[PDB]
Each structure stands twice: as C-alpha cells, then as structure tokens.
Amino acid sequence: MDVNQQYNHFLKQHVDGEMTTLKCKSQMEILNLNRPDRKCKLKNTFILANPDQVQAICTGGGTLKGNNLVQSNKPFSVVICTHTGGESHPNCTYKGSSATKKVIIACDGKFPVHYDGDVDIGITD
C-alpha cells in the first residue's frame, strides 16, 4: 500500500504490543527528545496491538463521532504514561497505568493520524 508518513508517526507515538507501565520512563524520553525544548509531554497513551488492528478502526472497525474522530468498536489494552513532575528532559517523572478501553483517534481516509503529536489518543467506556 501507499505510505502515509502521519500513519508511521502515529504508530511510533501510539502503537506498541510490548508496552508496559514499567516502560513509561524509557518510552516518554524517546517522545520528549523530539519535542521543541524537550518539554515533558503531560500524557501519552500506547495501544497494545498490531498496526492492522488499529488501521482497521478507520476501515470497518470504528464509529465516526465528530471532527474526523473515530471510536474503535472493540476495546484495546492500553498503557497510559502520565506526568507527575518536571518541565523538560531529563527532569520528567511519569506514572504508568494499564486499562482496557475503546480508543478515539483521527482518521485520514484509511490512515490513523495525529497532528503535531502535542495531544494524545482518547479512551472511553
């Protein structure tokens, strides 16, 4: 299929089948090192699934809400990394939490996307 670089960016920021609460420090450092001023991102949600399962949200596996937002019809295992302290790397502190939730993402045609990666995917149910 065709490459959508925003889809690759989405997978890098939000899709990791091997993510755990204990891995928040290492995974957030990766995201924070690419942010202007290396400001501590206040939250990031990781989906424990393969790209095909998440891409499907855009092509038969999701409910259209509003403003290009689509809610997955099935729940996903997620890991949420939440800021507890720091303004910038390397003084960022995170708490990891696990949940099972339908995810809310942006779809550009058949491609999950995130614009500016300054926000996060949504969770519900």
Cα 43 to Cα 119: distance, rounded to the nearest angstrom: 8
Name the resolution in angstroms. Answer: 1.9
Q: Is 114 a catalytic residue?
A: yes
Cα 81 to Cα 7: distance, rounded to the nearest angstrom: 21
So where are the chain's domains? 1-125
Question: Quick one: CA dihedral 113, 70, 84, 12, positive or negative?
Answer: negative
* Tokens matching residue 118: 């300054």
61 exposure class (CB count in 10 Å sphere: 0-12, 13-18, 19+): middle
Report DSSP state, residue 15.
B
Q: Is 9 a catalytic residue?
A: no
* Tokens matching residue 85: 């302290």
Q: Give residue 97's region: left, alpha or beta (phi > 0; psi -120 to 50).
A: beta
